[PDB]
Design a binder for these strands. Structure first.
Ligand SMILES: Nc1ncnc2c1ncn2[C@@H]1O[C@H](COP(=O)(O)OP(=O)(O)OP(O)(O)=S)[C@@H](O)[C@H]1O
Ligand SMILES: [Mg+2]
Lengths: 53, 494, 53, 583
DNA sequence: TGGTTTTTATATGTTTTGTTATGTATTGTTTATTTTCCCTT
DNA sequence: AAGGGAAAATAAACAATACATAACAAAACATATAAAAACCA
C-alpha cells in the first residue's frame, strides 16, 4: 500500500500499538531482558475488554 | 490595464482637503483677525441649510378638521421657561457666563438618566447667554451642536466642529490638527469664544476613547476660548475612560440631573395646558372643527387626578418627562376616537379626559402580551409548551432536549386516550385527518409551531443540526407559561 | 510521517513539536496497518488477539 | 541596549590588513606539519577537478529526470480521444514530489491554461475557485496581448469573450496535505462545467504516498466520476533504480583508476539510502560528496592519483605507506618463499632508492572492477531486458565475490553466469587510495545518534571535558574540580536513577548530598575581592544556599533541553521526566 | 505661470492567521478489594 | 516444593485538566480616488 521506508513502516506500527494498547500493560508485553536487580514484572491485563478499541 | 484581484466600483470620496490649518499662514504673526474674516464662524453658510424647506412643499390643502382633542395633542409634543430645573440652569449658566466674560476656557459635565430635561436646559442656557451677548454684556460667541448619535463615524465630530469654526472641509486627521493649532497657538485677540455642546458623549467613546481626551484637553489651554458642555448618561464616564490623574488635571464641573419627582411631572404637564385647560372652544356640529375664543360653545377640562396618577406611575419607574407627556398624549387620543366615533366627524356639553382614559393609556404600555399571545395559539402550539413545562418539573433543568419534548408529546396522547378531545384529534394530528398518509414521527405542524415560537421570542433554541439532541429554553418565565396553560380548557384536565 | 497525515496531533494553530504538552496519535485504519505489518512480516494481530479477538 | 538581547542584528566585522599569505584555502598541512605548501594547493585543485567532474554529470542527470517526466506526463495528458466527451481525464502521479513543471501545448484555436493548487492555497472551496478563475483570466489576457467576477460563470462566458475554446488543467500539489472534504467539494463543483460544450478539464493528483489512501477519503460517488478515464503514472526517483544507477555510475567514472570503494562503505551507502525512500538522489549525492570531501582533507597521499606528482616522493611519505597491511602481507610472503634477507632488505627502508622505486610500479594498474561493473550492468540490461536492479548492490556483491549468487534471483542468467564471473584480487597499497568508513565519520556527521550523543555527554562527561593535572593546582577551583562534577552532569545521574514523577525537594536534597560541603565553602572564600560574596560565606546557611542556586539553574537547563516536564500547573512541586537514555 | 502626470493620504475591502473563552470529554487521584507469582522457609 | 505477602490489577467516586471549536482580532494583501507635488513647457 505505501512506499514508506523500512523504519517509517515500523513507526506506524508502533504508533498503532501506542494508541490502542494502554500504557499500563506495556511492560508485560514487550519486556524480555534478564534482571540483575530484584523486581517483579508487570502481570498484564487480568480480563479481556469487550469493546475492541 | 492590470487584472484586478477584486473591484470596488461604489467608492464615493468626499472633496475634503488634507493639509491642516497650521500650514497656510507661515507665521503666527501672519494669522489675520479671524473674527473679521468672511468664511469663518458661519457668515455665509446660512444659504444652503435653508435650501431643503422647498422640497417638502405642496400646494394642496383641503380644510383639515382640528377638533378639541387635536389641540391638546399638539401642545403635549416634546418640541413645543422651564420649572423643575432651576438650580441646574443656574449652575450651567453661572459657569458659562464667567468663562465668556473673562475670555477663559472651561468644561461643564452634566449627566443623568434619559429624558430628564438636560438637552433641553443646556439649549436654554445658551439661548439665555446668546441674548446676554447680543445686548453686549459678554462678547460674541459661536455655538456648535455636536451629537454623537447623529454621526456616522465617531471621528466626524472633528470634521463638523472645524467646519463650523472655519468653513473649511477637511478630513478628520487634518481637522484635529487644525483645531489643536487653533486653540493653543492662535492668540486670544484673533479668536472668538466657542461654546461646543458634545451631546451623547457615550456614543463617541465606545471604541478608542481618543475623542473625549482631546475636547477636554483643549479647554486647559490658556489661549483657547472653548467651553465644552459635555452631556452624557452616566457620572463615571470621565473617570473610567480617561483615568484618575487626567480627570483631576482638567478640573471640570460635574452636574447630575436626578429624574423628576411626581410633583414635578404635574408642573410639566399642567404647564403645557395653561392655554387650553378650563377654556372655551367653538365647535360646529357638522364638521367637528374647534376654534379657541350650528355651533355650540363647548368647553374642556382635564381631570387633575388623571394627571396625578399619570405622574405617580411614570416618576416611580424612570422619572422622565417624555413618558409622561406621551401618556397624556396617548390618553388625549383615546378620548378623541370615542368623540370621533359618537358623532362621526371623520377626516377632511363638556368634554373631558377621564381617569379611565389615562389608566387605559397607561395600562397598555405596562402590560405584557405573552399571556394573551399564548392563550390563543393552536392546540399544537399549546401542546408544545405544555410538554415543555412537564419536562421542567420532572428535572428543573430549564433547557430541555428537543427529542425529549417529542417523546413527551407522544406519551401525552398515549396516556390520555380515554379523553373525548384526544380521541378525535389524534387521527388529525398523526395522519393529518384521512388515510393514505402514514402514521408519523412528529405531530402535524411540528416544524411550523417550533418556528412560530422561535420567531415570537418565546422560545430559544441552540444551533445544532441534529434535530433531536438540540436544546430548547424558554425566554419568558415558567410562571407566566403555566398561567397561560391553566386557562385553556382541554390541556388543564389532561 | 506527520506531514503525510499518517500521525496526527491535537489541533492548535502553530503547534510546536518541541513541547511537553503536545501528544500524538495515529490516523490510519486497521486495514492499512494490517497491510503494513504483513510486509515486514510483523504479526500485529497477536498484539490485538489477546485483548479481545 | 545590548546586541545580545536584541533579535537579528547585523555585524559588519573588521578584517585585518593582510595576513602576508595566499594560504586562504581550508586544507591544512598533514603529516603533523611535514607536508609542503605546494602539496596542499595541489590537493586542493585536484579535489575541485574531481568534484566538479562529478557534479557536471549529476546536474546533467537531474536535468534528464525532469525532461523525461515532462514528456512522459505529456504523452499521457493528450490525445486520449474519448467518444463520450463528458468527463475529465485524471492523472494520478504515484509518489511524485510536487516540484515538476508541466508544459502545455501551444495548439492554437484553443486555450491551454495550467492551474496549480497547493493545500495552503486551498483553505475552503471558494478560495480554490477564486484562485482558479483568477489564474485562467490572468493567463488568458497574457496570451491576448473590463473586469470579471471570479467564479465558474467565467467558464461559460469564455467563448463569448475570448473567441477560442478552453482546455484547463488542474495540478494539485500536495494532495496528501489537503483535506479531502474540500477537494471532494471542488471536483463536484468542477463537474458543473460539463454542460458548456467548449471546455475540458484535466485533473492531476500528485499523490505522494498511495492511491488506496485517497479512495478511502473521497466519497464513493466522486470515485465513480474519477474512473471514466484515469491513468496511474508511477513517478519516483526510486522506481526501477534507473536514476540512482546513473548517479552512482557517474561517481565510479570519476574515481575510475584512481580511488577504490570498500564494501564497508558501499553497504553503508546501500543501507542509509533505504531509510529515506522519498528523497534518495540528494541523499545519495550527499554521502558520496562528504566521503570525497573527507578523503582529500585527511590523506597526504591524495596528490598521488595523478602520475605527475609521483616524482616528488619524500621520506615521511616512505615512513607512513609501509605500514599498509597489504604491504606487510607482501613482505611476509617474501619471507616464507625466498629464504635470503637481501632482497627483502632492498624492499625495506635501508635501501633508500628501492622502496620509492617500488611504489612507482603499482600506481598505473587499471584496477578493473570499475569497468567490469559497467560491463555487467550494460550486458545484464540489453540481453535479459532486466530493469529492476541496483547497480549499487551489484557493485557491492561484486566487491565480495557474490556476483553469481546475486544473479540467480532472475533465473535467466544461467547461460551467462560463467562468462560474467569475476573474482576480485587485492592490489597492493589499495588502503591508501580508497573510500571506507571504519572510523565512523559519516554516521556521526550526516546521520548522528542525536539524542544518544546528548545523554552520553551528560552522563559520562569524562569524554568531553579535559581532566588536566598540572594546571589545576594553580587556578582558583582546581582543588574542587577533581572532587566535583559539572552540575549538568551531576544532576543527570540523579535524574537517571530516579522514577518517572520526582519531587523537586527530594531531588534537591539528593543532589546536595553528592556535593563536598567543605571545599565548596573553601572555593567560595578563595576570592578575597568580592566583599558581598564573603558575607554570604560567613553565614551558617551558606552551603544550603549555594547548593540551591547551583541546583535550580541546572533544573532550569534541563527544561529547555526537554528532559523535564513540570506536571500539573498551579502546583510546581513535582516534575516528570521526559527522556530516557538508550532509547 | 500652466497644464499634465505622478505620488501620497485617506479610505475601505479581502484573506490568512493567531488568541481566547468555554462546555464537554478525558485523565489523574484516592481508597477498598482481589489476583500473581518472587523470595524466604 | 509450599507458602507468605507485597506488587500489580480492578473498580468506583470525584476532582482537575485538556481539547475542539466559536467568536473575533489583527496583520498581510489589495484597490480607489481626491489632494499634493513635481514637472515639463
Ligand atoms: N423641565 C422640563 N420642562 C418642560 N419640558 C420638559 C422638561 N424636561 C423635559 N421636557 C420635555 O421633554 C423633552 C425631553 O428632552 P430632554 O429630556 O432634554 O432630552 P434628554 O435629557 O437628552 O434625554 P436623552 O437625550 O435620552 S439623554 C424636552 O424636549 C421637552 O419637550
Ligand atoms: Mg437630548
Amino acid at each position: 500500500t505505501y512506499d514508506l521506508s523500512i523504519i517509517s513502516k515500523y513507526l506506524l506500527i508502533a504508533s498503532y500499538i501506542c494508541s490502542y494498547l494502554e500504557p499500563r500493560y506495556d511492560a508485560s508485553i514487550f519486556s524480555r531482558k534478564t534482571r540483575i536487580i530484584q523486581g517483579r514484572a508487570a502481570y498484564g491485563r487480568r480480563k479481556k475488554k469487550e469493546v475492541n478499541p | 490595464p492590470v487584472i484586478r484581484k477584486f473591484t470596488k466600483k461604489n467608492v464615493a470620496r468626499a472633496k475634503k482637503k488634507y493639509t491642516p490649518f497650521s500650514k497656510r499662514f507661515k507665521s503666527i504673526a501672519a494669522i489675520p483677525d479671524l473674527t473679521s474674516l468672511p468664511e469663518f464662524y458661519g457668515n455665509s453658510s446660512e444659504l444652503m441649510a435653508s435650501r431643503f424647506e422647498n422640497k417638502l412643499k405642496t400646494t394642496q390643502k383641503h380644510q383639515i378638521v382640528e377638533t378639541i382633542f387635536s389641540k391638546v395633542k399638539k401642545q403635549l409634543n416634546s418640541s413645543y421657561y422651564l420649572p423643575a430645573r432651576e438650580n441646574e440652569f443656574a449652575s450651567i449658566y453661572l459657569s458659562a457666563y464667567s468663562a465668556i466674560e473673562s475670555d477663559s476656557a472651561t468644561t461643564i459635565y452634566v449627566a443623568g438618566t434619559p429624558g430628564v430635561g438636560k438637552t433641553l436646559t443646556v439649549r436654554e442656557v445658551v439661548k439665555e447667554l446668546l441674548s446676554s451677548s447680543a445686548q453686549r454684556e459678554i462678547p460674541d460667541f459661536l455655538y456648535v451642536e455636536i451629537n454623537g448619535l447623529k454621526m456616522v463615524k465617531p471621528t466626524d465630530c472633528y470634521e463638523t466642529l472645524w467646519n463650523k469654526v472655519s468653513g473649511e472641509r477637511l478630513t478628520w486627521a487634518a481637522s484635529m490638527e487644525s483645531l489643536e493649532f487653533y486653540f493653543k497657538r492662535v492668540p486670544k485677540n484673533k479668536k472668538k469664544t466657542i461654546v461646543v455642546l458634545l451631546d451623547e458623549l457615550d456614543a463617541m467613546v465606545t471604541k478608542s476613547q481618543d475623542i473625549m481626551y482631546n475636547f477636554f484637553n483643549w479647554t486647559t489651554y490658556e489661549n483657547a476660548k472653548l467651553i465644552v458642555i459635555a452631556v452624557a448618561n452616566t457620572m463615571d464616564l470621565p473617570e473610567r475612560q480617561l483615568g484618575n490623574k487626567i480627570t483631576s488635571r482638567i478640573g471640570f464641573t460635574r452636574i447630575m440631573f436626578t429624574g423628576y419627582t411626581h410633583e414635578e411631572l404635574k408642573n410639566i404637564i399642567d404647564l403645557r395646558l395653561k392655554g387650553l385647560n378650563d377654556s372655551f372652544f367653538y365647535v360646529d356640529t357638522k364638521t367637528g372643527n374647534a376654534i379657541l375664543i350650528d355651533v355650540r360653545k363647548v368647553r374642556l377640562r382635564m381631570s387633575a387626578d388623571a394627571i396625578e396618577i399619570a405622574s405617580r406611575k411614570v416618576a416611580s419607574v424612570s422619572g422622565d418627562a417624555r413618558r409622561a407627556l406621551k401618556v397624556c398624549k396617548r390618553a388625549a387620543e383615546i378620548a378623541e376616537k370615542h368623540y370621533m366615533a359618537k358623532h362621526g366627524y371623520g377626516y377632511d356639553g363638556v368634554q373631558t379626559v377621564h381617569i379611565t382614559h389615562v389608566m387605559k393609556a397607561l395600562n397598555e404600555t405596562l402590560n405584557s402580551h405573552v399571556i394573551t399571545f399564548m392563550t390563543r395559539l393552536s392546540f399544537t402550539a399549546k401542546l408544545f409548551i405544555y410538554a415543555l413545562l412537564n419536562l421542567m418539573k420532572k428535572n428543573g433543568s430549564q433547557e430541555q432536549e428537543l427529542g425529549d419534548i417529542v417523546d413527551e408529546i407522544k406519551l401525552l396522547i398515549e396516556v390520555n386516550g380515554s379523553n373525548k378531545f384526544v380521541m378525535e384529534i389524534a387521527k388529525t394530528l398523526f395522519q393529518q385527518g384521512s388515510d393514505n398518509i402514514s402514521e408519523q414521527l412528529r405531530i402535524i405542524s411540528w416544524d411550523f409551531v417550533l418556528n412560530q415560537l422561535l420567531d415570537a421570542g418565546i422560545l430559544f433554541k441552540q444551533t445544532m443540526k441534529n434535530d433531536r439532541i438540540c436544546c430548547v429554553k424558554l425566554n419568558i418565565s415558567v410562571e407566566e407559561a403555566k398561567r397561560a396553560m391553566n386557562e385553556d380548557e382541554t390541556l388543564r384536565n389532561l | 510521517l506527520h506531514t503525510l497525515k499518517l500521525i496526527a496531533t491535537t489541533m492548535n494553530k502553530n503547534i510546536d513539536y518541541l513541547s511537553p504538552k503536545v501528544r500524538w496519535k495515529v490516523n490510519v485504519p486497521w486495514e492499512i496497518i494490517k497491510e503494513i505489518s504483513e510486509s515486514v512480516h510483523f504479526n500485529i494481530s497477536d498484539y490485538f488477539s489477546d485483548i479481545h479477538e | 541596549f545590548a546586541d545580545a538581547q536584541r533579535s537579528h542584528y547585523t555585524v559588519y566585522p573588521s578584517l585585518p590588513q593582510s595576513n602576508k599569505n595566499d594560504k586562504h584555502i581550508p586544507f591544512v598541512k598533514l603529516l603533523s606539519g611535514k607536508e609542503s605548501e605546494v602539496n596542499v594547493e595541489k590537493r586542493w585543485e585536484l579535489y575541485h577537478q574531481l568534484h566538479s567532474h562529478f557534479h557536471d554529470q549529476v546536474d546533467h542527470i537531474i536535468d534528464n529526470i525532469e525532461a523525461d517526466l515532462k514528456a512522459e506526463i505529456s504523452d499521457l495528458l493528450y490525445s486520449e480521444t474519448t467518444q463520450k466527451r463528458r468527463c475529465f481525464n485524471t492523472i494520478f502521479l504515484l509518489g511524485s514530489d510536487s516540484t515538476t513543471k508541466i508544459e502545455l501545448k501551444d495548439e492554437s484555436s484553443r486555450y491551454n491554461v495550467l492551474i496549480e493548487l497547493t493545500p495552503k492555497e486551498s483553505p475552503n472551496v471558494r478560495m480554490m475557485l477564486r484562485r482558479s478563475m483568477y489564474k485562467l483570466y490572468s493567463a488568458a489576457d497574457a496570451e491576448e496581448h473590463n473586469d470579471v467576477s471570479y467564479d465558474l460563470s467565467l467558464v461559460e462566458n469564455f467563448k463569448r469573450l475570448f473567441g477560442k475554446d478552453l482546455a484547463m488543467v488542474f495540478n494539485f500539489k500536495d494532495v496528501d496535505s489537503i483535506n479531502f472534504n474540500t477537494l471532494d467539494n471542488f471536483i463536484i463543483l468542477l463537474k458543473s462545467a460539463f454542460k458548456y460544450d467548449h471546455v475540458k478539464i484535466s485533473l492531476i493528483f500528485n499523490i505522494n504516498t498511495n492511491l488506496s489512501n485517497i479512495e478511502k477519503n473521497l466519497r464513493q460517488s466522486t470515485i465513480r466520476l474519477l474512473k471514466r478515464n484515469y491513468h496511474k503514472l508511477d513517478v519516483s526517483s526510486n522506481k526501477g533504480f534507473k536514476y540512482g544507477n546513473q548517479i552512482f555510475q557517474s561517481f565510479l567514472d570519476t574515481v575510475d583508476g584512481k580511488l577504490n570503494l570498500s564494501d564497508r562503505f558501499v553497504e553503508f551507502i546501500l543501507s542509509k539510502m533505504a531509510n529515506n525512500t522519498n528523497h534518495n538522489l540528494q541523499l545519495l549525492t550527499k554521502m558520496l560528496d562528504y566521503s570525497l570531501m573527507s578523503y582529500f582533507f585527511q590523506n597526504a597521499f591524495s596528490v598521488f592519483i595523478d602520475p605527475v606528482n609521483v616524482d616528488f616522493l619524500n621520506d615521511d611519505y616512505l615512513k607512513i605507506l609501509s605500514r599498509c597491511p597489504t604491504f606487510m602481507f607482501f613482505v611476509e610472503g617474501l619471507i616464507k618463499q625466498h629464504a635470503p634477507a637481501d632482497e627483502i632488505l632492498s624492499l625495506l627502508t635501508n635501501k633508500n632508492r628501492g622502496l620509492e622505486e617500488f611504489f612507482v610500479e603499482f600506481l598505473v594498474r587499471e584496477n578493473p572492477i570499475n569497468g567490469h561493473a559497467k560491463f555487467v550492468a550494460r550486458f545484464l540490461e540489453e540481453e535479459l531486458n532486466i530493469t529492476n536492479f541496483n547497480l549499487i548492490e551489484l557493485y557491492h556483491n561484486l566487491l565480495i565475490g557474490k556476483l553469481d549468487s546475486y544473479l540467480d534471483r532472475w533465473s535467466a542468467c544461467k547461460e551467462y553466469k560463467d562468462r560474467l564471473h569475476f573474482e576480485p584480487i587485492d592490489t597492493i597499497f589499495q588502503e591508501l587510495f580508497t573510500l571506507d568508513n571504519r572510523s565512523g565519520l559519516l554516521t556521526q556527521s550526516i546521520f548522528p545518534s542525536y539524542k544518544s550523543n546528548i545523554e552520553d555527554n551528560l552522563l559520562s562527561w569524562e569524554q568531553v571535558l579535559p581532566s588536566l593535572d598540572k594546571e589545576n593546582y594553580d587556578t582558583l577551583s582546581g582543588d574542587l574540580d577533581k572532587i566535583m562534577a559539572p552540575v549538568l552532569g551531576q544532576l543527570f545521574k540523579l535524574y537517571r536513577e530516579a522514577n518517572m514523577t520526582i519531587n523537586i525537594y527530594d531531588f534537591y536534597i539528593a543532589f546536595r548530598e553528592t556535593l563536598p560541603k567543605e571545599e565548596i565553602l573553601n572555593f567560595i572564600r578563595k576570592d578575597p575581592s568580592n566583599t558581598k560574596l564573603l558575607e554570604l560565606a560567613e553565614t551558617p546557611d551558606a552551603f544550603d544556599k549555594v547548593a540551591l542556586i547551583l541546583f535550580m539553574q541546572a533544573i532550569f537547563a534541563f527544561e529547555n533541553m526537554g528532559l523535564i516536564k513540570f506536571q500539573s500547573t498551579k502546583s510546581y512541586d513535582l516534575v516528570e521526566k521526559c527522556v530516557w537514555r538508550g532509547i
